[PDB]
Nucleic acid binder design. Structure first.
Lengths: 96, 94
DNA sequence: GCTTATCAATTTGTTGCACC
DNA sequence: GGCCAAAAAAGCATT
DNA sequence: CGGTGCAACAAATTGATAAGCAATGCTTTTTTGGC
């Protein structure tokens, strides 16, 4: 799996950034996205996808193991809608 | 917030890192994520989420406008799963 | 229209990555 | 940075 | 740089309700490269 460490190393190798800055940058990129999202704003990254917020009303759920009917509480969740560009690049992938 | 807006916001707060560098980095980071998924490998950023690949079996779909059938090949689609920190920070409701 | 995802609670095996 | 025309990408219809 | 511990990760249960999508032309936004 790709990690922040791998991302930093990549920024270092490709852009010649100091390992300090590469590290901070990766961290910031993700943080900025979180900031927008927690702030109710949609994030649209052209060529990748959109991170949208959906408000879900309470609905019936259950403790899977037992069967005890428990409600899934109302909540605001973050979803990702991959764009056509990303989707095409991935359609013919083969899990490594 | 678009890609460019994300870049501007980062540059702004990181006065010590050159704006051009920030732009290049964001672009590079995204391309890296993209190619990773294109290679069939997953992405896992603790506190943000993970991107995995989901399989879709071949099927006889329809062109929704005309109704004609279309033979669809099996394939892979990206799937994002928000991590704990992101879920919690996003959820405004209890 | 039909397919796929969302989620409950809980246990168990794995890992990103902060912190030394 | 701004502005601009052109191209790429996405948004919409409905998806 | 590298060792380490642990919260955050993954997976697995069932079933009612929510969300997403096959094609593709036209419209709208966003990126791009030059000034």
């Amino acid at each position: 799996a790709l990690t922040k460490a791998e991302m930093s190393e990549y920024l270092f190798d490709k852009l010649g950034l100091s390992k300090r800055d590469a590290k901070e940058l990766v961290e910031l990129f993700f943080e900025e996205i979180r900031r927008a999202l927690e702030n109710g704003e949609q994030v649209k990254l052209s060529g990748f996808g959109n991170f949208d917020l959906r408000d879900k009303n309470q609905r019936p759920g259950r403790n899977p193991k037992t069967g005890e009917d428990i409600p899934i509480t109302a909540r605001r969740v973050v979803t990702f809608r991959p764009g056509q560009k990303l989707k095409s690049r991935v359609e013919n992938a083969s899990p490594k | 917030m678009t890609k460019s807006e994300l870049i501007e916001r980062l540059a702004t707060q990181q006065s010590h890192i050159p704006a051009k560098t920030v732009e290049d980095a964001v672009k590079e980071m995204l391309e890296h994520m993209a190619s990773t998924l294109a290679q069939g490998e997953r992405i896992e950023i603790r506190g943000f989420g993970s991107f995995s690949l989901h399989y879709r079996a071949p099927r006889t779909g329809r062109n929704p406008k005309t109704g004609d059938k279309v033979e669809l090949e099996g394939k892979y689609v990206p799937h994002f799963k928000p991590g704990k920190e992101l879920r919690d920070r996003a959820n405004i409701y209890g």
